Amino acid sequence: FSYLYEKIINFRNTLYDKGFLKIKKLPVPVISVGNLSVGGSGKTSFVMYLADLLKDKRVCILSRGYKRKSKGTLIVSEYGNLKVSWEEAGDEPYLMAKLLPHVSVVASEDRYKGGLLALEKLSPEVFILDDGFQHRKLHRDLNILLLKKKDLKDRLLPAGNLREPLKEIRRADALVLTYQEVEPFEFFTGKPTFKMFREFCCLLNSDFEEVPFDILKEREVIAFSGLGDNGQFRKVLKNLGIKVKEFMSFPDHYDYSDFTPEEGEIYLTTPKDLIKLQGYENVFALNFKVKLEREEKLKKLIYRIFY
Ligand SMILES: Nc1ncnc2c1ncn2[C@@H]1O[C@H](COP(=O)(O)OP(=O)(O)O)[C@@H](O)[C@H]1O
Ligand SMILES: [Cl-]
Ligand SMILES: [Mg+2]
């Protein structure tokens, strides 16, 4: 079937290419972050990295809200003020909202509408589209595309993980090449291109406070995650030399409703999972900083949108 999903996608894109479908424009600058495949690609992390670059602007992130308990357009946080449970928001928007005390977050299937409500209520100076590469109906002033090595040899859904053919790389203004710290790769296209690394430096307790890895020594952990790809987390742990006695691989966006930790055991998971387990005392998350090659170049490129 990957050949008529593909027909549909190609058709859709041609329509947008030729100007047969409406592209709408918000009255402030819009940066899109997205990728080409299902299965995680550093999008959420990159969006948080980006919001941080723009710390001197009023920033609003526009997200779709992936499997949440709420409908329509929803304000998740107002410049840091959380306003819904993580269930109501979707885990990614909530995580962003939580780790970015200075940013607003809006969840909306129709991103343009989300932007309008945000303008009305938050007067942001810049929008970041969380996962907005395929949402061509909303105009973006800077279209950033994340690629991981794996995408390069993947194929269209349902056969493979690609939501669109690799040729659609042409729609990007800038490419970000992710997971360099675990799957390095090069990719030259003549477009502005930036390698993204994750520096795994820190450990969080379940109240989102930094703690030394000191608790991990000469202790084997039970690790788990519910991510786009649990495999890369599992590998990061091995590369870090963290002793992992067991690994539980949960579905992306897993709700942990039936999760009950065993007494005396220590659990290691990600911030994306941890938001759903706040207060469980023996559960920790591996945390990291995002670092971009040629950050200075990315900045000049980003600030062009304000002129
Ligand atoms: N190797 C990892 N180490 C720590 N946290 C991770 C790791 N991989 C993913 N995460 C968590 O999951 C979030 C990203 O979700 P994921 O499903 O990997 O991809 P995407 O952002 O493309 O949806 C990150 O912000 C981080 O909180
Ligand atoms: Cl990530
Ligand atoms: Mg995701």
**And the tokens for 29?**
């600058």
| Residue to substitute in 37, 38, 44 for testing ligand 1 pocket (most ligand atoms within 8 angstroms of CB) | 44
Q: Determine the distance separating the centroid of ligand 2 and the alpha carbon of 43, expressed in angstroms.
A: 7
**E strands along 131-274, which residues?**
142-148, 174-178, 193-204, 210-211, 221-226, 244-250, 267-269
Beta bridge partners of 194: 176
Q: Determine the distance separating the centroid of ligand 3 and the alpha carbon of 40, expressed in angstroms.
A: 5
Other CB atoms within 10 A of residue 7 CB = 10
Q: What are phi and psi of 140, to 5 degrees?
A: -120, 140
In whole angstroms, what is the distance from residue 129 CA to residue 52 CA? 15
Ligand 1 is surrounded, with C-beta below 6 A, by: 40-45, 95, 227-228, 232-233, 236, 252, 270-272, 286, 288
Residue for token digits 């007067």? 123
Beta bridge partners of 59: 126
Q: Determine the distance separating the centroid of ligand 1 and the alpha carbon of 25, expressed in angstroms.
A: 30
| Ligand lying nearest the CA atom of residue 65 | 3
The residue extents of the domains of the chain are 1-307
- Do the beta carbons of residue 30 and residue 137 sit within 8 Å? no
**E strands along the chain, which residues?**
30-35, 59-63, 74-78, 81-82, 104-107, 126-130, 142-148, 174-178, 193-204, 210-211, 221-226, 244-250, 267-269, 283-292
Long-range pairs, 154-158, Cβ under 8 A, ≥24: 154/37, 155/2, 156/2, 156/5, 156/6, 156/9, 157/2, 157/5, 157/38, 158/1, 158/2, 158/5
Computed from CA positions of residues 66, 72, 73, 76, in that sequence, does the dihedral angle turn out positive or negative?
A: negative
Q: At what angle do helices 295-303 and 43-53 cross, to 10 degrees?
A: 70
Residue type, 196: M
Residue type, 56: D
Residue for token digits 């090659």? 293
- Do the beta carbons of residue 161 and residue 5 sit within 8 Å? no
Closest CA to 104 of 51, 153, 40, 64: 51
Which helix (H) or strand (E) covers residue 46, if one does? Answer: helix 43-53
| Residue to substitute in 201, 221, 270, 283 for testing ligand 1 pocket (most ligand atoms within 8 angstroms of CB) | 270
> DSSP character for 111?
H
- Do the beta carbons of residue 164 and residue 9 sit within 8 Å? yes
| Residue to substitute in 227, 247, 277 for testing ligand 1 pocket (most ligand atoms within 8 angstroms of CB) | 227
Q: Determine the distance separating the centroid of ligand 2 and the alpha carbon of 230, expressed in angstroms.
A: 11
> DSSP character for 14?
H
Nearest CA to ligand 1 atom 6: 270
